[PDB]
Amino acid sequence: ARQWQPDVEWAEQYGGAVMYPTKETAHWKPPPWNDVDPPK
Amino acid sequence: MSLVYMNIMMAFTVSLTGLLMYRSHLMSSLLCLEGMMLSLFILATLMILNSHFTLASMMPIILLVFAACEAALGLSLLVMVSNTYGTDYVQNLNLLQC
Amino acid sequence: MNLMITLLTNFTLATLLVTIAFWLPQLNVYSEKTSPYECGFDPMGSARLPFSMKFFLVAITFLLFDLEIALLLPLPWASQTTNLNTMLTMALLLIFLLAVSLAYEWTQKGLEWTE
Amino acid sequence: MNPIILIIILMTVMLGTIIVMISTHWLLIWIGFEMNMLAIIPIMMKKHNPRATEASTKYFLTQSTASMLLMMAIIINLMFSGQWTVMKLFNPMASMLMTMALAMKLGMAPFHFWVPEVTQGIPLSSGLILLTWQKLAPMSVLYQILPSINLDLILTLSILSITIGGWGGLNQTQLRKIMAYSSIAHMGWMTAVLLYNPTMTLLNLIIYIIMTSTMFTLFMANSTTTTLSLSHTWNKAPIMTILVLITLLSMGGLPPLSGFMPKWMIIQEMTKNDSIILPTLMAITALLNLYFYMRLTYSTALTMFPSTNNMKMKWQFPTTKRMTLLPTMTVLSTMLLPLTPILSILE
Amino acid sequence: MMTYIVFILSIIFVMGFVGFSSKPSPIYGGLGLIVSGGVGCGIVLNFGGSFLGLMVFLIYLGGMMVVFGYTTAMATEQYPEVWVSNKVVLGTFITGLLMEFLMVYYVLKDKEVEIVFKFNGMGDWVIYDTGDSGFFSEEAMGIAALYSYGTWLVIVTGWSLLIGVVVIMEITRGN
Amino acid sequence: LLDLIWLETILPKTISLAQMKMSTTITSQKGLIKLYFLSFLITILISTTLLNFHE
Amino acid sequence: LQYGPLAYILGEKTTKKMTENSKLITVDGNICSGKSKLAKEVAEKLGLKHFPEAGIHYADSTTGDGKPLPVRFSGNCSLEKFYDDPKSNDGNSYRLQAWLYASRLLQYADALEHLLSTGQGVVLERSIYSDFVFLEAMYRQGFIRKQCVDHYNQVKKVTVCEYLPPHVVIYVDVPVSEVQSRIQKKGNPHEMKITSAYLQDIENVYKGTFLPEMSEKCEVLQYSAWEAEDAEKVVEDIQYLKYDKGPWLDQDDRKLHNLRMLVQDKLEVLNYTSIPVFLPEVTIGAHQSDRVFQEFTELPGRKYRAGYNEDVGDKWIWLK
Amino acid sequence: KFYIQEPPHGSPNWLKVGLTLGTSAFLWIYLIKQHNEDVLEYKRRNGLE
Amino acid sequence: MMTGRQARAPLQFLPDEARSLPPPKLTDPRLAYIGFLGYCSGLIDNAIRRRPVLSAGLHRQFLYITSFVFVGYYLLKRQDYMYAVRDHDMFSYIKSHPEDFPEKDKKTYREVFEEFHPVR
Numbered sequence A: 001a002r003q004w005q006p007d008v009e010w011a012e013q014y015g016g017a018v019m020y021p022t023k024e025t026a027h028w029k030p031p032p033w034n035d036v037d038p039p040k
Numbered sequence B: 001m002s003l004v005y006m007n008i009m010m011a012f013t014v015s016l017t018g019l020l021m022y023r024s025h026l027m028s029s030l031l032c033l034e035g036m037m038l039s040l041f042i043l044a045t046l047m048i049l050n051s052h053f054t055l056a057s058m059m060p061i062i063l064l065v066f067a068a069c070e071a072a073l074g075l076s077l078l079v080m081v082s083n084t085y086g087t088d089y090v091q092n093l094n095l096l097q098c
Numbered sequence C: 001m002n003l004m005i006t007l008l009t010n011f012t013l014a015t016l017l018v019t020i021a022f023w024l025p026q027l028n029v030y031s032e033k034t035s036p037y038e039c040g041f042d043p044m045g046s047a048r049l050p051f052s053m054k055f056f057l058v059a060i061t062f063l064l065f066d067l068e069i070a071l072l073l074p075l076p077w078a079s080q081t082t083n084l085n086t087m088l089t090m091a092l093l094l095i096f097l098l099a100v101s102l103a104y105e106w107t108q109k110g111l112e113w114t115e
Numbered sequence D: 001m002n003p004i005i006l007i008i009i010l011m012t013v014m015l016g017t018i019i020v021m022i023s024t025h026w027l028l029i030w031i032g033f034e035m036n037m038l039a040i041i042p043i044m045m046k047k048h049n050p051r052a053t054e055a056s057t058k059y060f061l062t063q064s065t066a067s068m069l070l071m072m073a074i075i076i077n078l079m080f081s082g083q084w085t086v087m088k089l090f091n092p093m094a095s096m097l098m099t100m101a102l103a104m105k106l107g108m109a110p111f112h113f114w115v116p117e118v119t120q121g122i123p124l125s126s127g128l129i130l131l132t133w134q135k136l137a138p139m140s141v142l143y144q145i146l147p148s149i150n151l152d153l154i155l156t157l158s159i160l161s162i163t164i165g166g167w168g169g170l171n172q173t174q175l176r177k178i179m180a181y182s183s184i185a186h187m188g189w190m191t192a193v194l195l196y197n198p199t200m201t202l203l204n205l206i207i208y209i210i211m212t213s214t215m216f217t218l219f220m221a222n223s224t225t226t227t228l229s230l231s232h233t234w235n236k237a238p239i240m241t242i243l244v245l246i247t248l249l250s251m252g253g254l255p256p257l258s259g260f261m262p263k264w265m266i267i268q269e270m271t272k273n274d275s276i277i278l279p280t281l282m283a284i285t286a287l288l289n290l291y292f293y294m295r296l297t298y299s300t301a302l303t304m305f306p307s308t309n310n311m312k313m314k315w316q317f318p319t320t321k322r323m324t325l326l327p328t329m330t331v332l333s334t335m336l337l338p339l340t341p342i343l344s345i346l347e
Numbered sequence E: 001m002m003t004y005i006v007f008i009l010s011i012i013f014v015m016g017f018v019g020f021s022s023k024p025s026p027i028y029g030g031l032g033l034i035v036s037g038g039v040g041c042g043i044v045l046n047f048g049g050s051f052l053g054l055m056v057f058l059i060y061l062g063g064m065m066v067v068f069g070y071t072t073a074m075a076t077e078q079y080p081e082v083w084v085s086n087k088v089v090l091g092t093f094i095t096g097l098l099m100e101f102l103m104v105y106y107v108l109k110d111k112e113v114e115i116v117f118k119f120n121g122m123g124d125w126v127i128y129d130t131g132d133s134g135f136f137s138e139e140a141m142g143i144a145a146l147y148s149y150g151t152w153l154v155i156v157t158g159w160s161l162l163i164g165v166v167v168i169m170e171i172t173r174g175n
Numbered sequence F: 001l002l003d004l005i006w007l008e009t010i011l012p013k014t015i016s017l018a019q020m021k022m023s024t025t026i027t028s029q030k031g032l033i034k035l036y037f038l039s040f041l042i043t044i045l046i047s048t049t050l051l052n053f054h055e
Numbered sequence G: 001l002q003y004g005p006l007a008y009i010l011g012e013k014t015t016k017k018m019t020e021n022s023k024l025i026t027v028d029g030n031i032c033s034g035k036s037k038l039a040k041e042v043a044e045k046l047g048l049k050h051f052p053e054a055g056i057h058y059a060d061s062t063t064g065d066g067k068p069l070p071v072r073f074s075g076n077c078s079l080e081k082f083y084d085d086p087k088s089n090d091g092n093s094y095r096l097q098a099w100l101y102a103s104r105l106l107q108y109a110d111a112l113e114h115l116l117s118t119g120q121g122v123v124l125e126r127s128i129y130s131d132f133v134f135l136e137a138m139y140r141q142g143f144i145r146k147q148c149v150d151h152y153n154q155v156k157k158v159t160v161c162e163y164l165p166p167h168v169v170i171y172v173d174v175p176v177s178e179v180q181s182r183i184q185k186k187g188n189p190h191e192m193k194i195t196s197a198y199l200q201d202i203e204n205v206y207k208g209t210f211l212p213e214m215s216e217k218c219e220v221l222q223y224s225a226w227e228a229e230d231a232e233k234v235v236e237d238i239q240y241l242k243y244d245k246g247p248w249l250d251q252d253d254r255k256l257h258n259l260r261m262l263v264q265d266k267l268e269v270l271n272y273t274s275i276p277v278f279l280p281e282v283t284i285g286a287h288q289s290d291r292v293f294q295e296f297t298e299l300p301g302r303k304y305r306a307g308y309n310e311d312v313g314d315k316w317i318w319l320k
Numbered sequence H: 001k002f003y004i005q006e007p008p009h010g011s012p013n014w015l016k017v018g019l020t021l022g023t024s025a026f027l028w029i030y031l032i033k034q035h036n037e038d039v040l041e042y043k044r045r046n047g048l049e
Numbered sequence I: 001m002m003t004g005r006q007a008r009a010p011l012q013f014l015p016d017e018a019r020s021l022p023p024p025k026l027t028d029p030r031l032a033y034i035g036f037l038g039y040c041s042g043l044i045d046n047a048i049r050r051r052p053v054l055s056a057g058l059h060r061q062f063l064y065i066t067s068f069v070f071v072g073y074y075l076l077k078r079q080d081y082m083y084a085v086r087d088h089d090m091f092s093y094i095k096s097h098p099e100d101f102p103e104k105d106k107k108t109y110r111e112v113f114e115e116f117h118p119v120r
């Protein structure tokens, strides 16, 4: 009855490394938050 | 034009395709940029010494300066690749693919 | 012409002291005398492992300071000019910029070695 | 970084761009590009993480290859002209090599393969420097050699840049890669009008730099680097959602906004020269740029994505950031279209 | 065939470029680039640039000694590729050499050739000046003019070397 | 059939799928210096040999 | 503003005031270790500034009038409902833990700001380096999920890497039975519902994970219950320490300048506490966030910036 | 007194207010002087007096 | 286009011949719109720093308005100068090339035959 605003199911579409995940772009995890990688 | 410019431009193109086709080893291609600087040096210097345009004779020296002034830059950027990873292989530099 | 004859002579009797150094004595080849040297014991690992350079920042700055003796080298010829105070100012500017570079590399501990 | 060294390195980046802009000699153009690259590499490695080192390595290799091709074009010009003046080039081979070199330095497609990588790897401030200030020296040299630029080459580079920069940003959720493919498409727009009217090239460059500086200043002021973190801005500072709304609708080329100003004028100069198909394809292909801009406005302004609990702490702290010229750039990027005949000052 | 001496040195220049451009290993890459930069100071020394050839020899000797130190410290593998260890090194090495001697054969048989530009096939002795420069070698005078005439070039080059040192010490820090 | 499927099919959905497919082919790169500069070499060779932009 | 790069250029080096009194000291211990006076006692011997332990309303105490805001504006959580219903459906446990981690991050930023601006050392109680032991005790007791631990580890991985450890970490050995005796003598009816296994897990993550990884980057001082009653012995042991471990020794003016430029900006400190990881314990939906944000704006002294509010008595707004 | 800490913008920065008003007054008087000089130069170069 | 005009006198924002032109009025609606842009910048500046938008920083809003009017006055002067240069060069090129611009003889519609296309 109120206005629709996006939920977690809608908002997790924009959280991947890409927007349209294909077979090649499937192992791509999103980058780190401070963009700093472990030193390995 | 003259016969030697054929081979100096040929050496530029050989070093160009050597730079522009990597063999998974970054130092082997940083040599190719230095070879392109060598070929540009010899080509410009043949042109300047040929025509006796003497005031541009200081030009290849200056050219050569910026040669190492970026080559050193590449080596300063070679050691940070080879401190993050044990090797300077260019296929380790693929984190920005996502 | 004479320069290439001289270099050909030097290279010729430097490589003809080698071809009579290998082919004149009697060879006895067995696969322990041609092994590498690690003070008698067998070498642990290859010598093609990365031997880490401690003087690497000094080695990169040597590439830049070696260009300066491609710039400071025409000074015996630059002193022959007829715009001479300008030459003197630019020469002292180049040695002063090299010195400011060396002072910056000193004080930021760039001349020290790592580890 | 030591701030004296940061000041000296940024003044050296600026000095390299100025030495490209003011000099009449080809060797000094090349020196300015070398100085610009050499000084901007530590701006990219300001943070010292592997992504900045990777971005700096890729940027060094692309810009060094471009500067090699630039100096070869300069030496072939020296052969076929016996001189060094920065003007038209006296050989189509040198013209092609210098156009390739400048297209690599701009990151125009198909040499575009470094701009999303390098732009993602580095911070937002250095990404701003990359996408705005580094688009000034090759556009100077392109402004200076346009009697010798091949028409087919610069138009192929331009429309290929517009198409690839349109399709690239649709698959992105990272804001820096969005701004990088936006950069590719806009450099295609600038170089397509280069041989017809380079005043429109300068107009598109200035309006683009205003809008891109606005968007990066909004990203820095909100501390957002992804789409999904930009989507929390309504719960923290809701005026910033309005500013990114008006600026992203401006960057899509929508009237009555100032980002419609370059595009339209470019079409206005390409239909005079009896080219109708090419600005039409360019305009229709700009709808892709508009589509991922609209995606960002949906996630940020027009809807409200769910936030977290810890945002309640950030309600109690204002921004102490230097949002330098952000209201000025926000006004200039949105409300400048009634001042469209100001472009005559760029003649 | 002694009038073709600059051409012969230029063949050795291209052979060194195919040597290090095939990229076997930067040991042998440094070897090939030293050979090319040492015959390239014999190409350009026969045009009158004795100062301007010895410097591209000397700067690149210092450069390849530095590059040797780094490819022994950073760019080292257990079995370095000499010239023939990899098929992709030897294949493009033979390819560059066969194409180079192919355009040698097409330019000595026909005395003209065309790859993008047109090139003569006569020995490059033909284009030299038939006069003398007096009591000055003119390339030495032109490089000496870097201090009298080249003041802005001095300023931008010395500033670029200064900030090159500063830039490199800002990169090689890690934190 | 028409105004929920086929008129929906012909203009908007096929154009949407085409731009999605081209977007996923452009951005499917493996982030490698080697492949990018090999593409630069192929660009230079097409510009010289195939398209004649040096003329 | 007051500090920036221009102040660093014009001579204000932050090691010109770094004296031997500038020691960041964090006192740790179990729930009723009796450290609560001990830290203050250290702060009345060494001349340091005591910060109390960050509750839910620490950010309320630093901003505005300093009074605690209502809990729907700060926290949206309760420690007493965690003591009553730890396995609750609304996810109060990890929501309380995430809010307390953000509050301790803010307190540690305030501590480093005081230490680097004034040169006076700060005595903290349970800094961000010891906040994870309550998370791990809650996870061993099954109060939270593994996704909550992963969210905490991501936030900690991207926030604690930019800070320094304390100089001194003081830990107080109090056994579980003595903790329970002090809880029963405390009189708090919610706090008496703490299980024994939760206290034992706090002590285990202390002695097994926290102190063996902090003993390399700082100096531990582990006391028992009776010898922590005498503050003179503890301060005497502090004053005769040989500060040699940890990354405080290789800190020049530049690194501490970069740290001070990070630390004084509180929205950059709290930048990664609200990462877009949609976890049901901490994700507040759109309409509730809009409603609580518009109710927060209508509070006195919260509608504008901290000198621009006529309803609290700010004058000369037209010249500010 | 309401705020528990003294805010950075509790009092107006009177140096900055003085610089702002002085700069704005200088730009207005220089603009009006420039415009009067421009209309006088137009009327002199075209004789429109 | 006009790049060869401003090459004998380089980097002149306003040349000397630009003083032969009437300057914009201070009540120019373009200049009033630039002043309105300054006021909108002042409002956005008070909005993003969470000041009261209309009441706080009247000196700052006034320097926004003053700075935009001051820059925009010279920008309008250079705009009007460049369009006057465009028209001057147009008219001089038409005058110096009469053979490229013939005087057209406008026929009346009693001789001009147009095909009628009926809408039926």
Ligand SMILES: CCCCCCCCCCCCCCCCCC(=O)OC[C@H](COP(=O)(O)OCCN)OC(=O)CCCCCCCCCCCCCCCCC
Pocket: D123, D125, D126, D128, D129, D132, D133, D136, D202, D205, D206, D209, D210, D213, D217, D220, D321, D322, D324, D325, D329
């Ligand atoms: C045809 C040729 C035309 C030439 C025109 C030349 C005009 C001036 C130059 C414009 C070119 C782009 C300028 C911006 C370059 C980027 C500057 C930059 O990155 O500054 C760094 C700084 C970072 O901010 P901070 O938050 O402190 O950083 C945290 C740690 N990094 O700050 C920032 O990142 C914030 C942004 C500051 C600069 C933005 C404002 C200047 C440019 C916008 C247009 C202004 C209108 C006047 C000029 C119009 C033409 C551009």
Ligand SMILES: Nc1ncnc2c1ncn2[C@@H]1O[C@H](COP(=O)(O)O)[C@@H](O)[C@H]1O
Pocket: G030, G031, G032, G033, G034, G035, G036, G053, G079, G096, G097, G100, G131, G134, G135, G191
């Ligand atoms: N991260 C945390 N999670 C749950 N409770 C905590 C946390 N940190 C502190 N507390 C509580 O804070 C109080 C500290 O005890 P005191 O020694 O009286 O300050 C005890 O009730 C603890 O259980």
